[PDB]
């Protein structure tokens, strides 16, 4: 009777007007605060995803076979059961899953039975008994799993992660204040390319992270790293171009970063670095260097080597003196020096032909020079300056960036 | 008692709040799973399209004289009996009838007496033993029929439509997986302006479309077209403007499509095409170049020649870098670049003005350039993108775009 | 008691709510499906067109003498019973009377004693077996009758109609897909000034039309005429001011039709005309013109000869431009040029300040020229322009257009 009342309650017109898009650009039905699924869901055959939020003890019929466009499920606190032919259809059709488990039962054991899975988002609250999860160790059934985002307290890395060593390409953990141990599993990653260990309570770089051989993007955000020292073997990560190490407590960058000549994306913002090294600037390949909100005192004049740098965010730092060597590099497109400790702005800025971003908000300045009109790619919306200093500009200089 | 009670419960005001609008901007009323049909529905005067779905064995009252704006009778699995004055009224007023049935006896026999009917949608199997097009042999009585949709699993096209197609102007045949033996029988059917052969599993383009001359919108959706080499003869069709060769197995485009200068919308999406020949890029009249969900790895620069292009949808392709010449065409209104492998979007998009909705979510886009805010008509609903990608724009430029969302 | 309940149900205020107006701008009151006639509806002296559609058991009391403006009685499927005083009142106020009937069953009998009415309409099949036009034999006492319109699917021309029509001015015959055998019997019909033959499916012009020198309007709509080779015999007439050969399949209009100078209104839309000759436009006072839905590939030369016109209908053909030929006309007020392949509007259309309407429902214009900003007389509600096409005008011009819409 509950299902009969629900079917009458939720006409197909109501579900059609409920239709919207998700964060993955798919047609998603956000079914929230319900007793079960209506049978009029499957009349919308153009659907590509369902968001089931807090809909427990749900039995999916075989009529899901009408959802030919379906390729994603998002189960939020739902203890859902499925039927055999529906299980086969979603085994032969589904690609993306995202299950949140506030309670253990809300994580279903049926969802690992598929094999066409590519992307998985295992958000929730996992118990510390991680190796006992045979439901986890069923990810070996998935023969195409490439994205694995576990937003849970992953103390010890599962052997489920071992069983998906090759086919995985994106690996994401939000450990939320728990130390990440049992490093041999992350040693067993062979073809993993993106390692996203966000807040794994790593007191330094794990030897497992460094035993990776095919990594391309490493993120150790909110991990209290003490040093970057083992870098004599980062040369084997020639495939690596993205180093994400911001919101951390690193205080220095040694010369060892010269080992990777393919590094492009470098993140060191919100760190404990008090003086930027020159041997960091010795590398010239680096195109993205993020150091916002740091404690940097000054920039050594070796930054002129960094010609390919298209992003040097030194904003909101302690930097009082900016050398003229940085203005020699003309490829710097996104430059933010807002809320810094500077006194005057360098007149020689016109050589930066490709310069879209300039941010100087909060920093103390005496008089804006006319040479701010010398920038070619600068825009008034791109040049974030206060209205009072907007007044302190010549009218032609105003129109130089104001008129498109 | 039940019919009288249904007349009683379905009050006028609840029908007024039940009124909706269709894709054709006509007032609408969907009657789904009722014992009969309410007389207060028939008391309405502003209603234009009434939708009779799953109505078991009802009779149409003559109170349809009140339904003057009624023009589209939608019959879904409804065995309808008819009163004679209402029959005359529908003969002189009703102009569009859609009939879906599960049994060939479910179709009303008074539909042939209709004379003002032009649009017919016979969805459901007309092909049966001794009822194969003999039931609809009464559409010879229909005179002004111009749209004849047939989702009916037809093994061979009827001789009755060969008799009728002198006045027919659209022939949408959906067999859901049954091949037509056309036998060049459309030569007597000379007045078609649109032909929509969808899900017919033809596996090749028949020569009946080639014998015709008046077609301007040709759709061959899901016909399993592996090769489309015949299109060289399509220059004979001097009036075609929309060659919807989508949802097929097309793996390449022959260069003779360059002879088709009259194309305005070329819907090749969900095909297996991996390279665009430059000869296809000769046609200056292309406006809707949808090549989405295909195997294209690069976009030729000659796209800058296509100045009339408005909506370039290359969604879910292998295009890594957009050439600057893509922004040479200033008429791009909807650049659907989503789900691609675009590494970075060049700043030349700031020159575009007609851009109203650009799709970049699901790409390899590192950051959103500032010049993307230079487009006036672009708004947040138009600029669909990941939130962190939105955050890369300057907060003053982000304020401009958030204001375009607001203002 | 039944009449009391009906009187209470339909109060005077309720009738004022239902008071509408017809195409003749007369006060109409649509009374449909009532068990009895009301008395308050006869109390209202404002009523001019008393409508009685499918109202059974009708017995009109002398309170119909209370009606002042009663000149129309639309009694449809109504058996009317009228007393002698009310009949005598009808004999001095009633002027027009429409009958809808199912053969002899719903034909009133008091209409023959009416000798002072001036208009009358009839509708309903009359050619029954053993009763070939025998039920309309009592219309001889009507002397002041002036207008008679018939839609009665006549298989043959009634001899009683030919005898009756001596005192007739306007006569329209509708056969709805039936042969009309005039057989040169309209030579007696000398007094006819408008002859309408709607859907007579003649395929030949009867030779009796060429004998009447009072006809100013000749209407042959939906006659399925393909080759008009009888207009050469129309040269004898010198009264036809407007021919109506529209909704036909006339492949070409011959040369000799350019000898009719008295023609002032050409309704030839939805035809098969491929090229309209310039010699045909030697008649330059073609005030009204209907040529839509045709196959004209260009607007020909002697439209420049035309000077005494007010509209041209060029909707749905293959004309690409407004040439100087349409630009030598200085009195056009409405342009019906929609859903065309019209490439551009040249400059001189921006001198056409007296431009009531334009129709552009899908035309291929690049942009509206700034010369259209030269005319503030054309307002946004006045012209019909696509929203994307309308927005290309300058912001001052668009603001002036919205202002003149308010002003």
Tab-separated table of N, CA, C and O in Angstrom, chain A residues 192-290:
chain	number	residue	atom	x	y	z
A	192	UNK	N	48.607	3.888	-11.123
A	192	UNK	CA	47.923	5.050	-10.567
A	192	UNK	C	48.612	6.337	-11.000
A	192	UNK	O	49.842	6.433	-10.991
A	193	UNK	N	47.808	7.330	-11.377
A	193	UNK	CA	48.321	8.605	-11.854
A	193	UNK	C	48.022	9.770	-10.926
A	193	UNK	O	48.842	10.684	-10.827
A	194	UNK	N	46.883	9.763	-10.238
A	194	UNK	CA	46.478	10.876	-9.381
A	194	UNK	C	46.266	10.354	-7.964
A	194	UNK	O	45.325	9.598	-7.706
A	195	UNK	N	47.145	10.761	-7.052
A	195	UNK	CA	47.059	10.401	-5.641
A	195	UNK	C	46.630	11.640	-4.867
A	195	UNK	O	47.367	12.629	-4.806
A	196	UNK	N	45.438	11.589	-4.275
A	196	UNK	CA	44.855	12.726	-3.565
A	196	UNK	C	44.678	12.333	-2.102
A	196	UNK	O	43.595	11.929	-1.677
A	197	UNK	N	45.749	12.470	-1.319
A	197	UNK	CA	45.695	12.153	0.107
A	197	UNK	C	45.480	13.450	0.881
A	197	UNK	O	46.410	14.081	1.386
A	198	UNK	N	44.215	13.846	0.968
A	198	UNK	CA	43.831	15.081	1.640
A	198	UNK	C	43.625	14.783	3.117
A	198	UNK	O	42.724	14.021	3.485
A	199	UNK	N	44.467	15.388	3.960
A	199	UNK	CA	44.372	15.295	5.420
A	199	UNK	C	44.417	13.837	5.888
A	199	UNK	O	43.521	13.349	6.579
A	200	UNK	N	45.471	13.132	5.482
A	200	UNK	CA	45.714	11.770	5.931
A	200	UNK	C	46.546	11.717	7.206
A	200	UNK	O	47.045	10.642	7.561
A	201	UNK	N	46.702	12.857	7.888
A	201	UNK	CA	47.479	12.979	9.125
A	201	UNK	C	48.902	12.456	8.940
A	201	UNK	O	49.455	11.756	9.790
A	202	UNK	N	49.496	12.804	7.801
A	202	UNK	CA	50.841	12.361	7.456
A	202	UNK	C	51.842	13.309	8.108
A	202	UNK	O	51.909	14.491	7.756
A	203	UNK	N	52.616	12.790	9.063
A	203	UNK	CA	53.613	13.607	9.743
A	203	UNK	C	54.783	13.957	8.833
A	203	UNK	O	55.552	14.869	9.155
A	204	UNK	N	54.936	13.249	7.718
A	204	UNK	CA	55.889	13.595	6.673
A	204	UNK	C	55.398	12.930	5.394
A	204	UNK	O	54.272	12.427	5.332
A	205	UNK	N	56.239	12.932	4.369
A	205	UNK	CA	55.912	12.161	3.166
A	205	UNK	C	56.049	10.676	3.479
A	205	UNK	O	57.119	10.242	3.945
A	206	UNK	N	55.012	9.869	3.270
A	206	UNK	CA	55.162	8.423	3.450
A	206	UNK	C	56.097	7.833	2.407
A	206	UNK	O	56.224	8.346	1.291
A	207	UNK	N	56.769	6.749	2.792
A	207	UNK	CA	57.600	6.030	1.837
A	207	UNK	C	56.751	5.356	0.763
A	207	UNK	O	57.237	5.126	-0.348
A	208	UNK	N	55.486	5.059	1.073
A	208	UNK	CA	54.551	4.538	0.079
A	208	UNK	C	54.286	5.530	-1.040
A	208	UNK	O	54.253	5.142	-2.214
A	209	UNK	N	54.055	6.799	-0.691
A	209	UNK	CA	53.831	7.847	-1.684
A	209	UNK	C	55.042	7.955	-2.597
A	209	UNK	O	54.926	8.237	-3.799
A	210	UNK	N	56.226	7.702	-2.034
A	210	UNK	CA	57.468	7.840	-2.770
A	210	UNK	C	57.830	6.570	-3.533
A	210	UNK	O	58.732	6.599	-4.382
A	211	UNK	N	57.182	5.450	-3.206
A	211	UNK	CA	57.332	4.219	-3.970
A	211	UNK	C	56.421	4.180	-5.184
A	211	UNK	O	56.486	3.219	-5.956
A	212	UNK	N	55.551	5.176	-5.341
A	212	UNK	CA	54.824	5.342	-6.589
A	212	UNK	C	55.809	5.539	-7.730
A	212	UNK	O	56.875	6.131	-7.553
A	213	UNK	N	55.467	4.997	-8.896
A	213	UNK	CA	56.375	5.069	-10.031
A	213	UNK	C	55.707	5.694	-11.249
A	213	UNK	O	56.392	6.085	-12.200
A	214	UNK	N	54.379	5.801	-11.237
A	214	UNK	CA	53.635	6.366	-12.355
A	214	UNK	C	52.736	7.531	-11.952
A	214	UNK	O	51.758	7.810	-12.651
A	215	UNK	N	53.040	8.209	-10.849
A	215	UNK	CA	52.189	9.293	-10.380
A	215	UNK	C	52.311	10.523	-11.271
A	215	UNK	O	53.384	10.827	-11.800
A	216	UNK	N	51.194	11.230	-11.436
A	216	UNK	CA	51.154	12.489	-12.168
A	216	UNK	C	50.696	13.667	-11.323
A	216	UNK	O	51.112	14.796	-11.590
A	217	UNK	N	49.856	13.437	-10.317
A	217	UNK	CA	49.369	14.498	-9.442
A	217	UNK	C	49.329	13.971	-8.018
A	217	UNK	O	48.606	13.014	-7.727
A	218	UNK	N	50.109	14.590	-7.135
A	218	UNK	CA	50.149	14.234	-5.724
A	218	UNK	C	49.619	15.399	-4.900
A	218	UNK	O	50.123	16.522	-5.011
A	219	UNK	N	48.608	15.130	-4.076
A	219	UNK	CA	48.026	16.130	-3.189
A	219	UNK	C	48.141	15.639	-1.752
A	219	UNK	O	47.551	14.617	-1.387
A	220	UNK	N	48.896	16.373	-0.942
A	220	UNK	CA	49.029	16.116	0.484
A	220	UNK	C	48.510	17.304	1.288
A	220	UNK	O	49.142	17.755	2.245
A	221	UNK	N	47.356	17.832	0.883
A	221	UNK	CA	46.753	18.966	1.573
A	221	UNK	C	46.337	18.587	2.987
A	221	UNK	O	45.864	17.476	3.245
A	222	UNK	N	46.534	19.534	3.910
A	222	UNK	CA	46.228	19.388	5.333
A	222	UNK	C	46.973	18.216	5.969
A	222	UNK	O	46.536	17.679	6.992
A	223	UNK	N	48.089	17.813	5.371
A	223	UNK	CA	48.980	16.808	5.929
A	223	UNK	C	50.215	17.511	6.466
A	223	UNK	O	50.939	18.167	5.709
A	224	UNK	N	50.460	17.368	7.768
A	224	UNK	CA	51.523	18.116	8.439
A	224	UNK	C	52.882	17.526	8.063
A	224	UNK	O	53.546	16.839	8.841
A	225	UNK	N	53.292	17.813	6.829
A	225	UNK	CA	54.595	17.378	6.344
A	225	UNK	C	55.701	18.147	7.053
A	225	UNK	O	55.604	19.363	7.243
A	226	UNK	N	56.753	17.435	7.449
A	226	UNK	CA	57.884	18.065	8.117
A	226	UNK	C	58.965	18.502	7.137
A	226	UNK	O	59.592	19.548	7.337
A	227	UNK	N	59.193	17.728	6.081
A	227	UNK	CA	60.257	18.036	5.138
A	227	UNK	C	59.971	17.371	3.802
A	227	UNK	O	59.123	16.480	3.693
A	228	UNK	N	60.691	17.821	2.784
A	228	UNK	CA	60.703	17.190	1.467
A	228	UNK	C	62.155	16.806	1.201
A	228	UNK	O	62.948	17.588	0.666
A	229	UNK	N	62.523	15.577	1.574
A	229	UNK	CA	63.923	15.186	1.660
A	229	UNK	C	64.313	14.022	0.757
A	229	UNK	O	65.446	14.004	0.262
A	230	UNK	N	63.414	13.071	0.506
A	230	UNK	CA	63.737	11.846	-0.216
A	230	UNK	C	63.820	12.059	-1.728
A	230	UNK	O	63.977	11.086	-2.471
A	231	UNK	N	63.780	13.316	-2.184
A	231	UNK	CA	63.496	13.698	-3.567
A	231	UNK	C	64.509	13.153	-4.575
A	231	UNK	O	64.283	13.241	-5.791
A	232	UNK	N	65.597	12.534	-4.103
A	232	UNK	CA	66.555	11.881	-4.995
A	232	UNK	C	65.910	10.791	-5.850
A	232	UNK	O	66.492	10.360	-6.853
A	233	UNK	N	64.718	10.331	-5.477
A	233	UNK	CA	63.965	9.372	-6.272
A	233	UNK	C	62.677	9.932	-6.861
A	233	UNK	O	61.920	9.168	-7.469
A	234	UNK	N	62.397	11.234	-6.715
A	234	UNK	CA	61.310	11.810	-7.504
A	234	UNK	C	61.653	11.896	-8.990
A	234	UNK	O	60.762	12.199	-9.792
A	235	UNK	N	62.912	11.651	-9.372
A	235	UNK	CA	63.295	11.648	-10.783
A	235	UNK	C	62.650	10.498	-11.552
A	235	UNK	O	62.478	10.594	-12.776
A	236	UNK	N	62.287	9.412	-10.862
A	236	UNK	CA	61.511	8.345	-11.488
A	236	UNK	C	60.061	8.741	-11.751
A	236	UNK	O	59.409	8.114	-12.590
A	237	UNK	N	59.548	9.770	-11.084
A	237	UNK	CA	58.242	10.309	-11.469
A	237	UNK	C	58.373	11.384	-12.540
A	237	UNK	O	57.946	12.525	-12.376
A	238	UNK	N	58.968	10.994	-13.670
A	238	UNK	CA	59.016	11.855	-14.844
A	238	UNK	C	57.629	12.126	-15.411
A	238	UNK	O	57.445	13.119	-16.122
A	239	UNK	N	56.654	11.266	-15.105
A	239	UNK	CA	55.274	11.500	-15.511
A	239	UNK	C	54.584	12.540	-14.636
A	239	UNK	O	53.511	13.027	-15.005
A	240	UNK	N	55.167	12.890	-13.492
A	240	UNK	CA	54.541	13.835	-12.579
A	240	UNK	C	54.695	15.258	-13.098
A	240	UNK	O	55.796	15.683	-13.461
A	241	UNK	N	53.580	15.988	-13.130
A	241	UNK	CA	53.581	17.406	-13.449
A	241	UNK	C	52.905	18.262	-12.389
A	241	UNK	O	53.078	19.485	-12.412
A	242	UNK	N	52.148	17.670	-11.468
A	242	UNK	CA	51.340	18.408	-10.504
A	242	UNK	C	51.764	17.999	-9.100
A	242	UNK	O	51.598	16.837	-8.711
A	243	UNK	N	52.293	18.953	-8.339
A	243	UNK	CA	52.648	18.749	-6.935
A	243	UNK	C	51.777	19.683	-6.101
A	243	UNK	O	51.926	20.908	-6.166
A	244	UNK	N	50.868	19.103	-5.322
A	244	UNK	CA	49.911	19.862	-4.522
A	244	UNK	C	50.270	19.694	-3.049
A	244	UNK	O	49.935	18.681	-2.429
A	245	UNK	N	50.952	20.690	-2.486
A	245	UNK	CA	51.423	20.640	-1.107
A	245	UNK	C	51.124	21.942	-0.378
A	245	UNK	O	51.988	22.504	0.302
A	246	UNK	N	49.903	22.452	-0.499
A	246	UNK	CA	49.531	23.673	0.199
A	246	UNK	C	48.590	23.359	1.361
A	246	UNK	O	48.130	22.227	1.529
A	247	UNK	N	48.324	24.391	2.173
A	247	UNK	CA	47.673	24.252	3.480
A	247	UNK	C	48.437	23.273	4.374
A	247	UNK	O	47.855	22.405	5.027
A	248	UNK	N	49.761	23.422	4.401
A	248	UNK	CA	50.639	22.532	5.148
A	248	UNK	C	51.542	23.352	6.064
A	248	UNK	O	51.418	24.577	6.167
A	249	UNK	N	52.464	22.657	6.735
A	249	UNK	CA	53.382	23.271	7.689
A	249	UNK	C	54.837	23.174	7.243
A	249	UNK	O	55.741	23.184	8.084
A	250	UNK	N	55.080	23.072	5.934
A	250	UNK	CA	56.442	23.026	5.417
A	250	UNK	C	57.101	24.388	5.605
A	250	UNK	O	56.492	25.433	5.345
A	251	UNK	N	58.348	24.382	6.082
A	251	UNK	CA	59.076	25.614	6.351
A	251	UNK	C	60.202	25.900	5.364
A	251	UNK	O	60.743	27.012	5.384
A	252	UNK	N	60.574	24.946	4.514
A	252	UNK	CA	61.676	25.164	3.585
A	252	UNK	C	61.542	24.220	2.399
A	252	UNK	O	60.952	23.141	2.500
A	253	UNK	N	62.108	24.646	1.272
A	253	UNK	CA	62.184	23.825	0.066
A	253	UNK	C	63.650	23.664	-0.321
A	253	UNK	O	64.267	24.621	-0.810
A	254	UNK	N	64.251	22.487	-0.118
A	254	UNK	CA	65.666	22.304	-0.480
A	254	UNK	C	65.896	22.230	-1.982
A	254	UNK	O	64.946	22.292	-2.771
A	255	UNK	N	67.165	22.097	-2.386
A	255	UNK	CA	67.525	22.056	-3.802
A	255	UNK	C	67.000	20.811	-4.500
A	255	UNK	O	66.948	20.782	-5.736
A	256	UNK	N	66.599	19.795	-3.729
A	256	UNK	CA	66.293	18.474	-4.261
A	256	UNK	C	65.170	18.488	-5.294
A	256	UNK	O	65.120	17.597	-6.148
A	257	UNK	N	64.300	19.502	-5.264
A	257	UNK	CA	63.229	19.650	-6.243
A	257	UNK	C	63.748	19.794	-7.672
A	257	UNK	O	62.962	19.718	-8.621
A	258	UNK	N	65.061	19.982	-7.848
A	258	UNK	CA	65.655	19.968	-9.180
A	258	UNK	C	65.591	18.595	-9.843
A	258	UNK	O	65.846	18.498	-11.049
A	259	UNK	N	65.280	17.535	-9.085
A	259	UNK	CA	65.248	16.190	-9.661
A	259	UNK	C	64.154	16.050	-10.712
A	259	UNK	O	64.358	15.394	-11.740
A	260	UNK	N	62.988	16.648	-10.478
A	260	UNK	CA	61.862	16.558	-11.402
A	260	UNK	C	61.934	17.739	-12.365
A	260	UNK	O	61.718	18.890	-11.975
A	261	UNK	N	62.242	17.450	-13.626
A	261	UNK	CA	62.270	18.458	-14.675
A	261	UNK	C	60.962	18.538	-15.451
A	261	UNK	O	60.881	19.289	-16.429
A	262	UNK	N	59.946	17.772	-15.053
A	262	UNK	CA	58.625	17.836	-15.660
A	262	UNK	C	57.590	18.476	-14.748
A	262	UNK	O	56.394	18.403	-15.043
A	263	UNK	N	58.018	19.096	-13.650
A	263	UNK	CA	57.081	19.682	-12.703
A	263	UNK	C	56.507	20.982	-13.255
A	263	UNK	O	57.251	21.895	-13.628
A	264	UNK	N	55.183	21.064	-13.301
A	264	UNK	CA	54.485	22.247	-13.789
A	264	UNK	C	53.607	22.897	-12.735
A	264	UNK	O	53.661	24.117	-12.560
A	265	UNK	N	52.801	22.114	-12.024
A	265	UNK	CA	51.876	22.620	-11.013
A	265	UNK	C	52.507	22.412	-9.641
A	265	UNK	O	52.632	21.279	-9.170
A	266	UNK	N	52.904	23.509	-9.001
A	266	UNK	CA	53.519	23.471	-7.679
A	266	UNK	C	52.680	24.293	-6.711
A	266	UNK	O	52.397	25.468	-6.973
A	267	UNK	N	52.290	23.677	-5.599
A	267	UNK	CA	51.470	24.314	-4.575
A	267	UNK	C	52.251	24.350	-3.272
A	267	UNK	O	52.629	23.299	-2.745
A	268	UNK	N	52.494	25.556	-2.753
A	268	UNK	CA	53.139	25.707	-1.454
A	268	UNK	C	52.530	26.858	-0.661
A	268	UNK	O	53.219	27.501	0.137
A	269	UNK	N	51.244	27.133	-0.867
A	269	UNK	CA	50.595	28.251	-0.202
A	269	UNK	C	50.189	27.876	1.223
A	269	UNK	O	50.056	26.699	1.569
A	270	UNK	N	49.996	28.913	2.047
A	270	UNK	CA	49.597	28.775	3.453
A	270	UNK	C	50.559	27.878	4.230
A	270	UNK	O	50.146	27.053	5.047
A	271	UNK	N	51.851	28.039	3.976
A	271	UNK	CA	52.875	27.203	4.580
A	271	UNK	C	53.666	27.997	5.611
A	271	UNK	O	53.452	29.194	5.813
A	272	UNK	N	54.591	27.302	6.271
A	272	UNK	CA	55.442	27.898	7.288
A	272	UNK	C	56.787	28.353	6.736
A	272	UNK	O	57.734	28.539	7.509
A	273	UNK	N	56.897	28.528	5.420
A	273	UNK	CA	58.152	28.977	4.827
A	273	UNK	C	58.331	30.458	5.132
A	273	UNK	O	57.450	31.277	4.850
A	274	UNK	N	59.475	30.808	5.719
A	274	UNK	CA	59.746	32.189	6.095
A	274	UNK	C	60.616	32.927	5.087
A	274	UNK	O	60.541	34.157	5.009
A	275	UNK	N	61.433	32.213	4.315
A	275	UNK	CA	62.262	32.804	3.269
A	275	UNK	C	62.231	31.870	2.069
A	275	UNK	O	62.549	30.682	2.195
A	276	UNK	N	61.843	32.396	0.915
A	276	UNK	CA	61.840	31.587	-0.297
A	276	UNK	C	63.272	31.286	-0.723
A	276	UNK	O	64.116	32.187	-0.723
A	277	UNK	N	63.591	30.042	-1.058
A	277	UNK	CA	64.935	29.727	-1.544
A	277	UNK	C	65.140	30.138	-2.992
A	277	UNK	O	64.194	30.270	-3.774
A	278	UNK	N	66.412	30.342	-3.344
A	278	UNK	CA	66.781	30.604	-4.730
A	278	UNK	C	66.908	29.318	-5.539
A	278	UNK	O	66.662	29.318	-6.751
A	279	UNK	N	67.293	28.218	-4.887
A	279	UNK	CA	67.414	26.948	-5.595
A	279	UNK	C	66.056	26.395	-6.007
A	279	UNK	O	65.981	25.555	-6.911
A	280	UNK	N	64.978	26.842	-5.358
A	280	UNK	CA	63.645	26.589	-5.894
A	280	UNK	C	63.457	27.315	-7.220
A	280	UNK	O	62.884	26.763	-8.167
A	281	UNK	N	63.953	28.551	-7.310
A	281	UNK	CA	63.882	29.309	-8.555
A	281	UNK	C	64.857	28.797	-9.604
A	281	UNK	O	64.749	29.195	-10.771
A	282	UNK	N	65.817	27.954	-9.214
A	282	UNK	CA	66.765	27.408	-10.185
A	282	UNK	C	66.058	26.567	-11.244
A	282	UNK	O	66.483	26.534	-12.405
A	283	UNK	N	64.980	25.883	-10.867
A	283	UNK	CA	64.169	25.161	-11.839
A	283	UNK	C	63.400	26.158	-12.698
A	283	UNK	O	62.783	27.092	-12.175
A	284	UNK	N	63.440	25.966	-14.017
A	284	UNK	CA	62.790	26.886	-14.942
A	284	UNK	C	61.541	26.307	-15.591
A	284	UNK	O	60.749	27.067	-16.162
A	285	UNK	N	61.352	24.987	-15.528
A	285	UNK	CA	60.193	24.357	-16.148
A	285	UNK	C	58.889	24.733	-15.450
A	285	UNK	O	57.850	24.824	-16.115
A	286	UNK	N	58.936	24.992	-14.141
A	286	UNK	CA	57.757	25.235	-13.313
A	286	UNK	C	56.941	26.403	-13.850
A	286	UNK	O	57.429	27.535	-13.938
A	287	UNK	N	55.693	26.124	-14.223
A	287	UNK	CA	54.786	27.114	-14.784
A	287	UNK	C	53.767	27.629	-13.780
A	287	UNK	O	53.322	28.773	-13.895
A	288	UNK	N	53.418	26.822	-12.780
A	288	UNK	CA	52.453	27.187	-11.748
A	288	UNK	C	53.144	27.074	-10.393
A	288	UNK	O	53.488	25.969	-9.960
A	289	UNK	N	53.344	28.210	-9.730
A	289	UNK	CA	53.968	28.264	-8.409
A	289	UNK	C	53.043	29.046	-7.483
A	289	UNK	O	52.883	30.261	-7.635
A	290	UNK	N	52.435	28.350	-6.526
A	290	UNK	CA	51.470	28.943	-5.607
A	290	UNK	C	52.094	29.060	-4.221
A	290	UNK	O	52.499	28.052	-3.632
